[PDB]
Design a protein around this nucleic acid. Sequence first.
RNA 1: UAUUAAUCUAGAGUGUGGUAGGGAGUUUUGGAAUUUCAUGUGGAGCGGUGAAAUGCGUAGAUAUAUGAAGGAACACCAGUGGCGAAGGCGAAAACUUAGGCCAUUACUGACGCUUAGGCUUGAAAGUGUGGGGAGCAAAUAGGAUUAGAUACCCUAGUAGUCCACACCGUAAACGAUAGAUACUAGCUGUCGGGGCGAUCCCCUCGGUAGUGAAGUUAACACAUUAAGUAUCUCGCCUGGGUAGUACAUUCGCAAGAAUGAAACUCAAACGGAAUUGACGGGGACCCGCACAAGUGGUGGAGCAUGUUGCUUAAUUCGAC
Lengths: 53, 65, 154, 160, 114
Amino acid sequence: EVKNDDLELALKKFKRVSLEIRRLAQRHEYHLRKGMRLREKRKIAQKKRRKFR
Amino acid sequence: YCRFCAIGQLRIDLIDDLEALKRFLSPYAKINPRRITGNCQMHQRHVAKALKRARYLALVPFVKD
Amino acid sequence: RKNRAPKRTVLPDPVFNNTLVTRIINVIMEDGKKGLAQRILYGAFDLIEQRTKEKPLTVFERAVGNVMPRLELRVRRIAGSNYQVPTEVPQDRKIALALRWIAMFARKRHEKTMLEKIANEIIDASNNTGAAIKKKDDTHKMAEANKAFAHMRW
Amino acid sequence: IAKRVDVAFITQRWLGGTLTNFKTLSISINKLNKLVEKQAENAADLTKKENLMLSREIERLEKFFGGVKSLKRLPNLLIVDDPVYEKNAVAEANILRIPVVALCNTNTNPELVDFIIPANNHQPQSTCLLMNLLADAVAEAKAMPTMFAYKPDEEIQIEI
Amino acid sequence: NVSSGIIHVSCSPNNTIVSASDPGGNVLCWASSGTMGFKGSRKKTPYSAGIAADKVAKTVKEMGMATVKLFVKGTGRGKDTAIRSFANAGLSITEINEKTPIPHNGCKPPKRPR
RNA sequence: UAUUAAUCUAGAGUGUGGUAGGGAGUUUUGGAAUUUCAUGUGGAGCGGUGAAAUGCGUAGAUAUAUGAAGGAACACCAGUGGCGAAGGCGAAAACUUAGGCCAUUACUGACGCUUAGGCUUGAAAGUGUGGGGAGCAAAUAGGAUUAGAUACCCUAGUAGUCCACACCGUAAACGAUAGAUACUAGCUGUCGGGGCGAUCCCCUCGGUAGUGAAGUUAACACAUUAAGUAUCUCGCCUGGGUAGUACAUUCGCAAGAAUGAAACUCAAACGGAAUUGACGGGGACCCGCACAAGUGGUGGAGCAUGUUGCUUAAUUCGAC
C-alpha cells in the first residue's frame, strides 16, 4: 500500500496489495514463455470465478 | 459503473472524466478489470483506452508518484 | 491414528492427600517396592529439613511449579530438509515430565550420599538453580529457534 | 389416497432392481411377513440392543420399502408424478411393456408413455387437485368414495 | 539529523539491505541481514533480517525521529519484521511507502532457472 | 446437365444509414526501468542453494539522491470480450488500410465452391552485412549433492541478443479437426449493432463457454458453438519398425522447404479409447504402544543360548 496506520483494518488489504504486486512482478523480473506468463493470471482469475459465482 | 452506458453514446473520450475514473481506478493507480468498472464490453474498451491515454497523458500515473 | 485416549492417575496417601507426591514416589521407586524408596526418602527429608528452613509443602510446590516446561517439539517434516514446529504441553504431561526428570536425575549419580542426592535435587529445584528449570528454558529456546519453521505450514 | 382408497403402494418408490424383477420384492414382502411373525416373540428377553436393532430394521423397512406389503404381482399401471423424479419407476417399467402413466414438466418429451399427460405437481396449488382427480377417477371401481370427478369440490392450498 | 530523513530498506528474500540516507542522499549507517556474522542461509531467516533491522534502528533511534517512513523496496517480509521491531520500541509509522519500481520493460530480466 | 434472348433475386457483394472491435501496414511521443558517470556520504560486508562454495568489498564496496545517459521494450489495462486470411492482435496517439456486424422492400441476373498452375505471408530460433550491445544468456569456466550429477543447485561469463537490409519457413501453426454450399430443438448468459426502453429486464440478426434429446460413435464423447445431414474440390493413410534412411528435386550463403525408400524383420503397431488395480518428489479419508510421551530394553558389559563366518568327520540340515 501507500499508507498504513490502522491496528487491524489496513493490514488485510495490504496482504492482497502485496499479493497483487508479486503477481505483477512475477512476469517481468524473470524472462520466460509468455504461455505460462499469462496462464498464471488466467488460472488465478478462473479460480477466483468458480469459487464465488 | 459509467454514466455513458446509461445515457447512450457508444464511445467516450478523455474530457477530464476523472471522477468516474476514480470509480474504475483503484487508489493504487492500476486499472481494475471489467468486473469492477461495470461497463458492458464496448464502454469497457473505451474506458480502457481512455485510462491508457491518461497514463500517457500523465493524467494518471503508471505507478510512480 | 488415535485422537483421544483418556489417561489415568493413582490414589494418594491419607495424610496429605496429593496425587503428585504418590506419582513422584512411584516413579523414583526402585526394585519395585517402596521400602528402599521409603528409606531414601526419609534420609533425603532429614537432610532437607536440617537446612533450608521453610514449610515443606510450600517449598515442594514451588519446586514443582517452577520445573514445569512451557513448549513441546512435535516433529514436522518439510519432505526436503525437515524442520520441526513446536507445540504445547498439557498440564498432566507437564507434571509427568517433571517427576520423570526428578526420577532420572535422582536415580544414578557419582556422589556419595544418595539421601543427599535426592535432598540436593529437591533443594536445587526449589532454589530455581538449573536442574529441571533449564528444561523449560531450553524448550522455550527451541521454539524461539523454530520460529521460522512454525511460520509457514506445508 | 392410501388412507382412503388403496390396494398397494410404496413409500417413496422402487429403489432399483425391484420393478423389472419382482423377485427381490416378493422376497421382500415374504420377509416382512416372517419378520412380523418372528418379532411378535421378541419381547426384550435376550438383548435390549438387539430389540432396538429389530425396531430399527422395521424403521428402515418403512423408509426404504415399507409400502411393499400387499402387492403380490407387477401392477398393470404405474403412476409417475415426474419423469425426472421416478428414474427407476420409469426405466424398469419401460424395460418391460406394462402400461405406464407419467407427467412431463419442463425438459422431456411428452411421448415417453402410452397416454399423454403434460400436467405438473411442482406448483403448490397443482398437485392437490391433480392427485384428488386422479384418485377419484379410479376409486369408483372399488365402490369407494369419489369426490373429485365432476363435483364442484376443489382445493386452494399451499404445499405442506 | 533532521526529524525526517530517509530510510532505504530494500527487502529481498536473500540478504535484505537497509541504510539511513540524508535528504541530500548521504547515508549515515547501513546494514544487511547477516551483518553480525550470519551471511549464508541463516541471514535469509527472519532472525538475521530483524538483527539488521534493529542494528540500523539503534544507529537511527537517536536522530530526532519519532515517526519515520518505510521505504520498502520489493515485496516480502522484511517490511513486516521492521515495522514490528519499530512498534515494539514505541516508534510509530507514518506510511508503508511501497518503493517497488514496477518493471517498465527496460533491461532484459534474467532467465528463469533451467 | 452446359446452356440461348430475356431471365426470377432468395445468394456474391453492392446503392444507403447505423455500426463495434487490443484487426493491421505507417508515423510520433510519454511513463519509467536499468545500470552507470560528475556528486558526496559510510563503516564491514556482498553471493547463494537442502547446506555452501565459485564469485565480489576498505585504494570506500552495500546502499544512497538528483543531474545526465545507452540499448531496450511498455506492471494493470486482459472479459459466457471483440477484432482476427493462419501465424495473431493491449503505454498511448494518429495517417492509412482491411475485415466486418446490423439493417436496405436493391441491383448485374445467380455472375459463385475447391484449387493443377501461379501469388502471398508466415510464431520463433538463428545467419552475412552495417551499427548497437542496455540487459541476460547458452557452451559452459569455477564451485554444491554425488557412485556419475554430465540433467536438475549457485556465481563469472561470451556466442547469442538487439535495430534495418538480405536469408530465414518450420511450431504441439491446433480446433490433435482444409475448406465452400444449403439445412437442422433448446437453454443459462453475454458481446456488436436495430434497438422501445436511467442503464435495464426484453429481444432481431451475427458472435462468444457450456448444455442435452434427435442425430453421431470402437469408446472417448460431440450435438444446431456436431465428431449431425446432404452437394463440389484440393491434401493424406492402407499393419508396425524399416521409413524420413539413401538418391534426387526447387529455393534458401547454411541450418532447413517438401519428398521419399529399398532390402529386411515381425505378425506385429510403445496403434487408439475405455474398467479396476499397481504407481507417484498428487490430494480427501478412519484406524492399531505403530508412532507422539515415557518405563525398561538390546547394538554396551558379566554373560548364555541362538545366526553367519570359519574350521572340519559331520562341526549335520533347514530356517534368514
